[PDB]
Amino acid sequence: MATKAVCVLKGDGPVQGIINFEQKESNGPVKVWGSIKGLTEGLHGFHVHEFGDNTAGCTSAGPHFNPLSRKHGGPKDEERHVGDLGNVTADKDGVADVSIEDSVISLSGDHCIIGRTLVVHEKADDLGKGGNEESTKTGNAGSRLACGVIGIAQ
């Protein structure tokens, strides 16, 4: 049934925002767009984590959503986690106007991201090209600044 999803991001600091998802055909890409504020200028890792579990804050969301058991990558890679959406970019006012299109995540089926956690991270995602253990796990993107559970939308 689901063609639209939405996510409210909050954390302990000032980072907050709203992200929209739209998938018109189940065999088609998902459009991801919206605004996150309170960010430092530059790149921030932007990931779908495995669990829609916020009991302990962002930490409860678990690792990247990774049902094919691959190593971390960027959204252009064949070797990637399902939840690898690469970076978003905050302007000099702390605002990331997100606009992404991705055909690996979905609003149904196995790769479905509904009821999982969208997280925006402290630092840039190195897209799995960093050369340490951590690169292949989380792309060295550091802290979880804000997260939310991805919800069915009207």
Catalytic residues, by residue number, are: 47, 49, 64, 72, 81, 84, 121, 144
Residue number with CB closer to a second copy (53 or 97): 53
Number of helices (H) and strands (E) in the chain: give both, helices first: 1, 10
Q: Are strands 144-149 and 117-121 parallel, antiparallel or unpaired?
A: antiparallel
Q: Which does 14 bind (CB under 5 to 8 A by kind): Zn ion, a second copy, none?
A: none
Residue 73 carries which DSSP code?
A: -
Task: In whole angstroms, give the CA distance from residue 154 to residue 73.
Answer: 31
Backbone φ and ψ of 11, nearest 5°:
-150, -160
Binding site for Zn ion (CB under 5 A): 64, 72, 81, 84
Binding site for Zn(2+): which residues?
64, 72, 81, 84
Residues making contact with a second copy (CB under 8 A): 1-2, 5-6, 8, 18, 50-55, 62, 67, 110, 112, 114-117, 148-154
Binding site for Cu cation: which residues?
47, 49, 64, 121
